[PDB]
Design an enzyme around this catalytic site. Sequence first.
Site: not given
Ligand code: CLF
Lengths: 522, 522, 477, 477
Positions: B152, B156
């Site tokens: 994500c 974004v």
């Molecule tokens: S580095 Fe850490 S775990 Fe990664 S997103 Fe970022 S805060 Fe979370 Fe949750 S939703 Fe899925 S896993 Fe990611 S790609 Fe979008």
Amino acid sequence: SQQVDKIKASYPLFLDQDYKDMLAKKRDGFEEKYPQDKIDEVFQWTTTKEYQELNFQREALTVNPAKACQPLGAVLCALGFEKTMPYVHGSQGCVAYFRSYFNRHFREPVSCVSDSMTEDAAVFGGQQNMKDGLQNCKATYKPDMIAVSTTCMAEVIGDDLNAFINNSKKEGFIPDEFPVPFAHTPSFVGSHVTGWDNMFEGIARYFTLKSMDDKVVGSNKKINIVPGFETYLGNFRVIKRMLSEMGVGYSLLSDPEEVLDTPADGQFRMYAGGTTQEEMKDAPNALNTVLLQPWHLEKTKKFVEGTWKHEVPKLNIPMGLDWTDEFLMKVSEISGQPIPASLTKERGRLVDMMTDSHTWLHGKRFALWGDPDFVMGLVKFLLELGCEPVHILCHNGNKRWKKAVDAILAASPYGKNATVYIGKDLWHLRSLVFTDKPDFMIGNSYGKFIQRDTLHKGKEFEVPLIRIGFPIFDRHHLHRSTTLGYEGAMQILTTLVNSILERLDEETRGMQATDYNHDLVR
Amino acid sequence: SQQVDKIKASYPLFLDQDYKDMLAKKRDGFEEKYPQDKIDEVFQWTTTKEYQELNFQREALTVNPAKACQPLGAVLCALGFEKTMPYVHGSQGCVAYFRSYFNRHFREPVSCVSDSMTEDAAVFGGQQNMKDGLQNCKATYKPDMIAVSTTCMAEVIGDDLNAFINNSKKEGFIPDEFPVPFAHTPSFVGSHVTGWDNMFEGIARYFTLKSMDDKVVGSNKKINIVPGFETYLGNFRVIKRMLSEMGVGYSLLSDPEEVLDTPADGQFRMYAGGTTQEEMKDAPNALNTVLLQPWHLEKTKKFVEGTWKHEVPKLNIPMGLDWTDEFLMKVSEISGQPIPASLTKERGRLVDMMTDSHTWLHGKRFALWGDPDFVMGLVKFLLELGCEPVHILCHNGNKRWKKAVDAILAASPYGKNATVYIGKDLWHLRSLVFTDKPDFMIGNSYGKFIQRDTLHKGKEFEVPLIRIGFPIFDRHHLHRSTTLGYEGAMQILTTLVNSILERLDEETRGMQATDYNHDLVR
Amino acid sequence: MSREEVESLIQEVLEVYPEKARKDRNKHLAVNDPAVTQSKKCIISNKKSQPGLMTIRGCAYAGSKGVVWGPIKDMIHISHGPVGCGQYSRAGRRNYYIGTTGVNAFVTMNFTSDFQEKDIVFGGDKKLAKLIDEVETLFPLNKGISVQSECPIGLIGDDIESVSKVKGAELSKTIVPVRCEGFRGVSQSLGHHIANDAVRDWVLGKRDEDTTFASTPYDVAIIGDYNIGGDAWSSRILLEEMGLRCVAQWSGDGSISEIELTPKVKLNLVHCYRSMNYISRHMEEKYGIPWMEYNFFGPTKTIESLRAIAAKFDESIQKKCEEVIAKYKPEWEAVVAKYRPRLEGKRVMLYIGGLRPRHVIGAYEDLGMEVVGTGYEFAHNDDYDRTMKEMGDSTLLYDDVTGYEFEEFVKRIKPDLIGSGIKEKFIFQKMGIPFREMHSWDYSGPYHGFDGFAIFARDMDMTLNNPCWKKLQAPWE
Amino acid sequence: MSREEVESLIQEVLEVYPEKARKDRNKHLAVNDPAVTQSKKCIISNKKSQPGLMTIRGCAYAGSKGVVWGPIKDMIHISHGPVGCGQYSRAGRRNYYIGTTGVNAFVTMNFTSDFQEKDIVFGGDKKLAKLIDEVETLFPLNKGISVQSECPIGLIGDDIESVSKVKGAELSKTIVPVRCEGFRGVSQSLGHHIANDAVRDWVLGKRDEDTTFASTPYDVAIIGDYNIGGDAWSSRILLEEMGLRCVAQWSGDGSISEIELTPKVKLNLVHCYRSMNYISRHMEEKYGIPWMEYNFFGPTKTIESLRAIAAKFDESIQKKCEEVIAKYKPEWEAVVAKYRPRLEGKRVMLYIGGLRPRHVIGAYEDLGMEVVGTGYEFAHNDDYDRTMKEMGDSTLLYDDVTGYEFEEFVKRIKPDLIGSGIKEKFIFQKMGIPFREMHSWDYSGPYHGFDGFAIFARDMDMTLNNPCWKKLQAPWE
Ligand code: CLF
Ligand code: ICS
Ligand code: CLF
Ligand SMILES: [Fe+3]
Ligand SMILES: [Fe+3]
């Protein structure tokens, strides 16, 4: 009273207030029941070590045995041949019990006939019964072979099977060329596995004893497989699959898998599959013969070595890693076919599952019972997983088998607390699991009552049952499972680890009391 | 205190008196905990219908979802190709979570890499990260193909996958001929199955879009099979076995069964099996393409019909009896090959088990949840068995799927008490099981907590969980099971009927209270 | 109605047999006439089964140990002989009871002597005495011991009566020898006779000189109900709602004290005629106790039986009977309204031994179901005398039917439902025909009484209207 | 030994990488020299990971939500953003607690905002306020809300601080905004830093003006113990047996009131330096509370720690410490006598993120086991400064190791046991090497304290001497 929208069966209908009042009035008024305190005292006494010492001094009384009589095994062996009718010479109640018992286990039709000997036969014998029964069965059910076992009635009255069948043939009741093997299967010697062995030896002798002049060992390039008393279809399937993947010519004698797994498609098939008469006649031309269950195929082994001149290998049951490996290596040596890569990958996958579940399996204590070969193979696998067998029971075992199991236990540090019992019944086992509580039981459905008794002592004293063996009456379709080879080892390992995890979840489900260890990931 | 002979883990050593006194002192001294009466009152309120009405008015908060994000499904799809390294463009925490989550489900090594984008990339994008990551991964783990998905983060910031890969290739970081398919997988759209669909569509487009001139439909006499997001290796195995039994030429695209079931033979295999690049290149030459799970394979269906010009059949998931029959008949029609006798016998045996267990399976009430195709197949099979699904939940479902499930329910009298929920979470399901109690739940491991809560209301209110779906964390090797075909239907039926029987045995184990119904035979 | 066609089918089915078997089996097949009262002129029964035709009958040991003596909960029953018998008969019959199994209750356990070769050669009287001593030591709360003989006991020269007498005198315990060898008789019925003879000879007369039990004019004993799935309980509550006092019930959930107190009751309500008429007539002869048959299968027979039983008593009991009928009327009316439309017009073929085949027809007729063929494994001519007026015109009657005969009859007649023992269940499930196992009731129940009628209707509906029966034909064939 | 061999091996393993990755990863591998107390001249840490090399590190959200804030049982933690983040981290860490889940405790639950496309495009502050209202509606017994930001929160410019302030003022509720976006920092360490800063800013100082808490000279706070498998509990008993009173427990089984009461203690006993040194130094600066590190892994280290802690108080605490040591001496002596002969001489390689790779060494030496290689995921130079003195000469050290690097290192050293996380477990089980999960204790434990030492020794024995490790090679190869 019953609500039409939610109708209750006996449970929990008889937990209603009016039914409880009825039962209380009945008990208090007319049953002359012992006081509850006396009953509790006596139960607590029967869960003690002194009661165990009294129980193990029994010499004449047998309580809740874990074995059956010979004609049952004879019938099951007979069902493994093509278009063949099991014919039991004696009384009809025996056949009724055999049919109902196999029907409850396999949940499939089981065909068997009796000649219905009565008080008249107790003084004249059963010549006429044999003649009329053979003629009637052949005329009615059109079978290709009739395999004849005996009840304890004809055994006590000393009926001569060979003379009866011969006189039936010479007087035209049945055709002379028509195949009618026989075996004496007396119920007061041995058990059902002994009956299977006797029936198979009788059939093999009938087909091969008088035609050994033109037989050459190894001329058909096949390996004979004798499964023995086996109530798992998956074992027949897996033996055939493993022999087929190796590209090994084989002949499975007494194969009942098809007749006990017929499809429901609008017709009834009394016969299906089975070993053909040609296969039995051609068996002495095989390279060798492998007995899957040697400890109750001794008479068969003697006849095979004496007559067919096959050097029968000294193999254990192919249950678990090492003994499956030994079976495969022996088959490869006999046939010359190398072990294929698919079997190697399957063995590696079983090893992988062992490594994955070893932490949960380590140190668990098991009581266990069943037939000798299955018990020893299961003990071997339990020692391979790092588990500790504690109470090993085999009601139909002998002293030589006990010595072999003791030698197996001495070879592993996980057998230091193990004891082997022969000639003991499930009441002895109930005492054993009360006084020296194991983590689990492994056995047939009769163990469920034992579990009940443990739960009556307390939740912390309850010993859960694991249904592996014969017969299983309170669960559906478990006869389709596998216990032999890598696949059977995988299935049994999965069952054991998941039973342990389910017990852990049950013990840890209490909100704010024990649910701190109720982990999502195990 | 610990006894060296019997060491206690967390349970039950925290149940000791000193630990209990410590915890009580801590709670009464410094936790400022609410009084137990208030806690009980609040829990009882949460069991009510008014709490359910408040709970279903939720618009912004989600508690305990039953879905994952797209890159997880993208990784699952990418593992299905030979010597292919999954490459997730974005932040490394996502990759760590994906790897741990698949490790806990499959209990196998799961390989994936990240380009580890940081705040610098959050400002200037991730060109340099993509170049360096592609070079490093190719040089270090030597994959034949690198499939690129996104977190994500990059979604974004709008990182352009095609431009980044092209710039990496033209600047010599990787050879121009090295296959690097890509797919955008935004986690704020759809769920993990959507990510699987996007990844597969990207790979198929990469290998087939620019080479359609020489392709002729049906010129290789095969049928393409696309399984979709699948976490049971038994399903891949049963599809392949059924196609091989029929003698149907087939190409299973995205086949990860080998890489998730490598043997433990002393070496680590990072890659094993999978769909070859040649198979993907030759895919447009097949007779047709079958999608096993059409309800999350819509984009791939659009690509396959629009570009490969394959007339994709309108088939449901081959779950249960009738839908497996329809799948087999459609395969027979497309391949011009008859259905063999072995499959007919297997179907008859499944029908036989159905007739055997119908009395215990009739009228039981089930809540259930999972992915759309699995949910609808399970509901169809439950209706075929005479069971009554009552609460059907699919968090990642849509409205057209809801109408399809409603149409399936309306076709059966057993679905009259069934309501279909989309977009609801497991807290909604908890409210539903409290207000309209079913007999059992069917779902993943996250349902265990629900069972706990019901057991807290009372033993008579507890709803047992049956672990079918994804993920299963608290049991071992259940990922080896099967849900598709007659084999999968047989396994599901056995699990259901034996769960019912196990619960019946639990409810009737009390001596002299309910053990009058503790029948030996069931 | 097509009486000649039923007669033709009988002949075509008989064609297969040899001449002697055909001549024997022809007398056990008949077409029912409701006007005929003497069944001996049409059907023969209580004969030896033909050899090798795969009968359904059991043995005398099954009729004595498994039926009459087994349900007695506070006594210990020893299977005297080899191990197979009690093992195959252990907990196979759902005779329900209340008690602490292993402490004061022993129905579901298997006590056996387990003969080996040496016991066959040199006898087993000393071993039986040692077994009795061991039973006394390990199970102190038992209230009596029964010794059920198996085939070798009769065949070899064991004399267990003298051993029972000596051990009972020594231990002040009731020890009842039962010569129920499987080769005696032709079926389980002689087992019933032998068990009732043992009951009168060793148990029934203990309290003949005792007059400490207070008796009321409303004392009855339920005879011949074995509490299958709780059946007896479902009957008993009704009798207690009618103002009666049930001193004893034979023998489901039964105690030896109940048997000993039975001669003190005023009326004997016999449910199973075939297994307990012997002791009923003995009590009528010796104690002057009147006995009557009743039926609690279905609302109609239950109401009629309740009214007759109340007519045996004074006006207050009759008023209570009317109150009970009025109380239970809406419940079974709701059951009928819910289940009759889905079972109306369906045809049933029932094979069961002794009492059940004519004794459950009324419940099927209450659901609007027609029984077109009914058969008995081991009944007598009087059971058929009752059956003929119980059944309809031109229906099939059949005694000790063989598997081949029954399969051919089912193929020709084509019923919607078959009620029979498990040995037929899977055969007819694979034939595509719904099956209900009457003896264990498919491990459901109870079916006696108003509360049992609801379960009966639910089970018949759930099996007959099962969606599995429409799926046995593959769509490609 | 063979330092030169280890360096040559490092070079050969390094050869595979491209030039830039080779130059970077060369600085993160080292050969231990216990005399060297400056790790910066020998190893570099706390840097960005090289792309595409399959690192083991997590993110800042894992460091804050999954490590620091998650164990707080009486608060509700909202994973603000898309759905995956809280789903993969739900109940994956065995941070044990006592409570009624869903009523007063919410540790194993997953609360999230679950953004869609519209939330990404138009922002999610209004959704956050509505979510807070709904949380207050359905969970009235919660005692505070934390808002853990995920990557899109920082990437779309959402203002969670203003929403938190407004909603906290409105509802009289403690709402703590945490900017723990996964792209911040390089690992979970900055997550620890952000979590401690938010604790300081929004929670720690709520009771500064409150003086109603009664204090004692024996008030200590356990900081940086997250009660993994009950670890913290096994610690607390010992501290309570020594005569101390533990006010708070950060943060396994911890509560917000305990955190608020923490500034009132007399001593801060820090177990995890790496995650809580920030708050420890802040509390020393602001309240004058001294803090000291201790180690409860293995009998030797826990005895040393107990003596050092008792040295901070009067003589009565010292006497109670000696009493506790004398009480627990026979138990761990018996554990050693049973298990040390089975583990003497075995060699272990470790790879855990911070603190544990060095504190678990002492217990391994207590069982007579040698650690030949150890490393960290996200430690700093101070952690290596503490580590280098406790490891042997010419032992391998390694920071943010890659999968390839660690696999080659294991292939060359060939240790008897490997202790790492779930992402290496099955890799090294398939290679034939016993593996212990040193994050979750293979779902067992606890390992802290005297009680935990027995479990630790039993687990190491059961995994290292498992027979399955002698069966990976089939007999026909
Ligand atoms: S580095 Fe850490 S775990 Fe990664 S997103 Fe970022 S805060 Fe979370 Fe949750 S939703 Fe899925 S896993 Fe990611 S790609 Fe979008
Ligand atoms: S006793 Fe008889 S065979 Fe009357 S031996 Fe048999 S529990 Fe049947 S039709 Mo099993 S004469 Fe009872 C009987 Fe009927 S065992 Fe039960 S069901 S009402
Ligand atoms: S007709 Fe009846 S059941 Fe048959 S024996 Fe006779 S009393 Fe008994 Fe028990 S032991 Fe086995 S089953 Fe028989 S053959 Fe010897
Ligand atoms: Fe079947
Ligand atoms: Fe694995």
